[PDB]
């Protein structure tokens, strides 16, 4: 029941204000004091904790949106799950102290029982559950959009010469990225007619054995389509690793920089000198 | 039935549309060998456009065909082996598979024509 | 104190097993049953809850590493902060039921008091705090590395012609990305000598007013360095938006595709036809 | 209602036919009196088509429309600017004196638009722009 | 003191190394005007390599110099206005700033030579 729960929250708000007073000392007092002045944080906290049970015992959609807004605000303000968990712990601690002192539970009785005694904690855990549920929505969404952008940015076949298709491949790549690159390169060479694919391995800091093996597989694959693979821009450590892999390197034609490699490619396709 | 052997110019053209595993593979092998032995064409051209899925058996049989009719004349696998089947061919049928022309049968015919003219 | 706390955890483990039995019904029973068989999850939970207080009342580094491993395992298994919070709530609920039934607290007394009564909940909140602290480390690290990769992949000036510097610009961009692009383009044109910069706006789905204004600013900036900006690859909606912006478009030389735009650029630098 | 709807659809599809095409040249004849929604349809179809069937120049046959509104003329000029931004000259063809007067009174800047009074002159000038296309 | 006016060929060369705000700006203005009025050179060349920070006053004064000596002869701002100062010049000194040569003073001299020869 939510009515007398709010009628006791009208003092539990002061209890939680004292709770914030006690808790400010342990976790980044200067940082929180600088980024958020104390009165507005206190009034936001009492607003979050007082109108949750102002509805008739069931739920509230408007306060659900308010709780989601509070979750995103504490995400932006610099309160991760650790800080919110500390807040819940100190909430419980000061509720314990207040009930040891105030001694006024929900139902009218000379000596209440365990029922409301733990209904309080169940409702505390429920509001914490809703808060943590609203906490991670924006984080998951931004992780997903960043992953999608990284996927679409990994293998740009858009840079295109006349009948030649270069490929930047600047960022560091892993196994997932390697599969994405091989797939995208084959798809791009299928859709667009070309004869030379200029792969720029320049840009990747360190390449292990298996990624280099996939790169050689990509070169052999575009050759087996029927387009020469003029891989360009090899760095020292990556060359050491490729040659230590033991894979044959006679079929791959290499060049130090894009200008010279594409000049050699235009030499290969003689009638593309102009 | 599924092996349309065509002779045009001083060449030979083939299109593949069966994608079956054993029976079509062996019948295509035998028909291509019999045709190339019957008519003497320096260049034979093979199409793999219709296919998008190949197991080990077909890849080995195709490499075998490459060696087969390379023992009597040059050839081009004109049609770009699709990415999935290309990857499967690399991982299993490890070879250069002759001369290639990458999906443009006009390009393959032109390449074979200029190779035979010289 | 941790000794008799473990001596009562030896039955609170069965209590929490019954807790898991009760809680499995509410949250994705088929999913959790399929991904993790019940006995291993139960033994992992009792291992997590039983050896935490096996040290002498102070702490444990080995069990701290074990708790971090448990946090990463429940992250990978599909238990976000909402599921862990539900687990904490049901932990408290079944501790309440057990103490209502078992009735055996830390200190030897005919009737214990509130001290251990709430020391139990304080320790529960503390282990939950450590769990949530270990929860977010990998997530923050992967967010940071994804952001860094997205930053380094946004504006690749690596694709380079002879005295011409093309720029892919394939992915969608925002204000932060716009500032990154303008900065990186200027830095790249400073380091490398060139005369024409081919910007490919092809690839971005939708461009608002301000990003288009920054693009025009980038064109004017590379012109004011002294290199012609032959912006190429304009889509319909983005062109509509650029022209609706009202910015002057006479100074920018445009082209439909890279091959033709670079051909026009080589026409501009006459002696680069070969 | 069904026949009204299908007839409106027919007028929708008959608005801006980019189908008339020459070698790397396009022309979009429009002859019925146009309105704001029709102007939006024309600009959308012109841009989408010129992207789909990429050609160097585009001829707009304004001849045919008696009178156009000032906002419609402004949107036509914006379409010319946009298709120039894509990389295609908007060689407007055969503007009537009344529409010319309306455009002049609009006060927008009028140098980038290339105009010829007849389709033959516009076509020959377009072939002049693509120098070796004239043969 | 900070305005090394050089005359070479049929041109004029300047290098900037003061980066001060008011005094150096005005003295450079007056010295450049007096030199271009004294000696008649069709092309004047200005260097901005040393500078990496410019406020509104210097940008306006530099555009004023461009107009100033453009009223008596063509010019090039040969040295690539650095990215920060280039951005500041765009956002405040909105102009094309004459002919430019992008950090290669040999390129600027060659461009001015070929412009004067024709």
Residue of C nearest to E76 (CA): C226
Interface check for C180 against chain E (CB to CB < 8 A): the answer is no
Chains D and E touch (3+ CB pairs under 8 A): no
Interface check for E83 against chain C (CB to CB < 8 A): the answer is yes
For chain B, report the end-to-end CA distance as a whole number of angstroms. Answer: 36
CA-based nearest residue to C220, from E86, A171, A7: E86
Instruction: Tell me how far CA of residue D48 lies from CA of A19, A106, C203, D53, D83, in angstroms.
Output: 63, 68, 16, 9, 10
| Distance in Å, alpha carbon of A55 to nearest chain B alpha carbon | 60
Other CB atoms closer than 10 Å to residue D46's CB: what's the count?
Answer: 25
Q: HSE of C58 in the Cβ direction (CA atoms, 13 Å)? A: 4
The size of the C-D interface in CB pairs under 8 A is 44
Give break positions in chain D: residue before each, C–N beyond 2.5 Å: none
**Radius of gyration over every alpha carbon of chain E, rounded to an integer in angstroms:** 13
Distance between CA atoms of residues C238 and C202, nearest Å? 10
Is C219 within 8 Å of C231 (Cβ atoms)? yes
Distance between CA atoms of residues A22 and A231, nearest Å? 64
**Cβ separation C217–E90 shorter than 8 A:** yes
Is B48 within 8 Å of B89 (Cβ atoms)? no
Other CB atoms closer than 10 Å to residue E56's CB: what's the count?
Answer: 13
Distance between CA atoms of residues C156 and A178, nearest Å? 19
CA-based nearest residue to A81, from C45, C59, C131: C131
Alpha helix ranges (H) inside chain B: 23-38, 56-70, 83-92, 105-117
Helices C175-191, E83-92: crossing angle, 10 deg rounding: 120
Distance between CA atoms of residues A85 and A82, nearest Å? 5
Distance between CA atoms of residues C62 and C52, nearest Å? 10
Is D39 within 8 Å of D72 (Cβ atoms)? yes
Interface check for E92 against chain C (CB to CB < 8 A): the answer is no
B61's tokens: 């049989």
Instruction: Tell me how far CA of residue C14 lies from CA of C9, C11, C85, C91, C123, in angstroms.
Output: 9, 5, 20, 12, 18
Distance between CA atoms of residues B18 and B50, nearest Å? 8
For residue A123, give every residue at least 6 positions away whose Cβ sits within 8 Å of its Cβ, in sequence order, or none: A5, A53
B106's tokens: 């006009």
* Residues of chain A neighbouring B94 (CB-CB closer than 8 A): none
- For residue C164, give the H/E element and its range: strand C164-167
Secondary structure, 3-state, chain D: CHHHHHHHHHHHHCCCCCCCEECCEEEEECCCCCCHHHHHHHHHHHHHHHHHCCCCEEEEECCCCCCCCHHHHHHHHHHHHHHHHHCCEEEEECCCHHHHHHHHHHCCCCCCCEEECCHHHHHHHHHHHCHHHHC
Other CB atoms closer than 10 Å to residue A145's CB: what's the count?
Answer: 12
C258 three-class SS:
helix
* Residues of chain C neighbouring A114 (CB-CB closer than 8 A): 96, 100
Is C178 within 8 Å of C208 (Cβ atoms)? no
Is E76 within 8 Å of E111 (Cβ atoms)? yes
C227 three-class SS:
coil
Interface check for C263 against chain A (CB to CB < 8 A): the answer is yes
Select the residue of C182, C223, C226 nearest E101 (Cβ to Cβ): C226
Beta bridge partners of D60: D28, D92
For chain C, report the end-to-end CA distance as a whole number of angstroms. Answer: 84
C239's tokens: 């062109």
Is C207 within 8 Å of C201 (Cβ atoms)? yes
Select the residue of B83, B87, B90 nearest A190 (Cβ to Cβ): B83
Burial annotation D76-115 (CB, 10 A radius, 16+ → b, else e): bbbbbbbbbbbbbbbbbbbbbeebeebbeeeeeeeeebbb
* Residues of chain A neighbouring C143 (CB-CB closer than 8 A): 139, 142-143, 146
| Distance in Å, alpha carbon of B102 to nearest chain A alpha carbon | 4
C29 three-class SS:
helix
Q: HSE of A21 in the Cβ direction (CA atoms, 13 Å)? A: 7
**Cβ separation B87–A190 shorter than 8 A:** no
**Cβ separation C81–A161 shorter than 8 A:** no
Would you give the DSSP letter of residue E23? H
Would you give the DSSP letter of residue C201? -
C86's tokens: 């539900």
Q: HSE of C185 in the Cβ direction (CA atoms, 13 Å)? A: 35
**Cβ separation D87–C256 shorter than 8 A:** yes
* Resolution to 1 decimal place, in Å: 3.9
The size of the A-B interface in CB pairs under 8 A is 40
Maximal CA-CA distance, chain B: 39
- Touching chains, E (3+ CB pairs < 8 A): C
Is C196 within 8 Å of C265 (Cβ atoms)? yes
Residue of C nearest to E96 (CA): C224
Distance between CA atoms of residues A62 and A113, nearest Å? 33
Would you give the DSSP letter of residue C270? G
CA-based nearest residue to A15, from A122, A104, A79, A123: A104
Name residue, tokens 């030499």: A267
Instruction: Tell me how far CA of residue A108 lies from CA of A105, A115, A124, in angstroms.
Output: 8, 13, 21
A86's tokens: 């500390």
C188's tokens: 């790249």
Residue of E nearest to C186 (CA): E83
């Amino acid at each position: 029941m939510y009515k007398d729960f709010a009628n006791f929250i009208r003092t539990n708000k002061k209890d939680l204000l004292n709770n914030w007073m006690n808790e400010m000392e342990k976790q980044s007092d200067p940082l929180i004091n600088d980024i958020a002045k104390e009165p507005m944080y206190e009034e936001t906290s009492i607003e979050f904790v007082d109108l949750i049970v102002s509805n008739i015992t069931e739920n509230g959609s408007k306060f659900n949106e308010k709780l989601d807004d509070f979750a995103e605000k504490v995400v932006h303000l610099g309160w991760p799950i650790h800080f919110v968990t500390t807040g819940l712990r100190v909430f419980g601690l000061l509720v314990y102290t207040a009930m040891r002192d105030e001694d006024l539970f929900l139902k009218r009785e000379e000596k209440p029982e365990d029922d409301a005694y733990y209904r309080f904690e169940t409702w505390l855990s429920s509001m914490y559950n809703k808060v943590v549920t609203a906490y991670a929505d924006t984080w998951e969404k931004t992780v997903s959009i960043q992953k999608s952008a990284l996927q679409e940015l990994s293998a740009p076949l858009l840079p295109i010469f006349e009948k030649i298709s270069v490929m930047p491949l600047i960022g560091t790549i892993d196994t997932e990225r390697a599969k994405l690159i091989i797939e995208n390169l084959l798809i791009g060479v299928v859709k667009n007619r070309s004869e030379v694919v200029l792969i720029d391995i320049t840009g990747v800091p360190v390449v292990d054995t298996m990624v280099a093996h996939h790169i050689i597989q990509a070169s052999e694959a575009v050759r087996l389509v029927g387009c020469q693979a003029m891989l360009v821009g090899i760095r020292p450590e990556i060359a050491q690793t490729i040659v230590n892999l033991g894979i044959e390197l006679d079929q791959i034609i290499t060049t130090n920089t894009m200008k010279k490699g594409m000049e050699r490619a235009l030499a290969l396709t003689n009638r593309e000198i102009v | 039935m599924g092996i349309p052997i065509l002779k045009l110019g001083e060449c030979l053209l083939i299109s593949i549309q069966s994608e079956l595993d054993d029976h079509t593979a062996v019948e295509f092998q035998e028909d291509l060998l019999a045709k190339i032995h019957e008519t003497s064409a320096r260049g034979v051209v093979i199409d793999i456009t219709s296919i998008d899925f190949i197991d080990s058996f077909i890849a080995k049989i195709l490499g075998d065909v490459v060696s087969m009719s390379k023992l009597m004349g040059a050839k081009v696998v004109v049609t770009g082996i699709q990415p999935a089947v290309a990857i499967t061919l690399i991982e299993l049928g490890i070879t250069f598979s002759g001369v290639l022309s990458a999906m443009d049968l006009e390009s393959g015919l032109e390449k074979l024509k200029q190779e035979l003219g010289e």
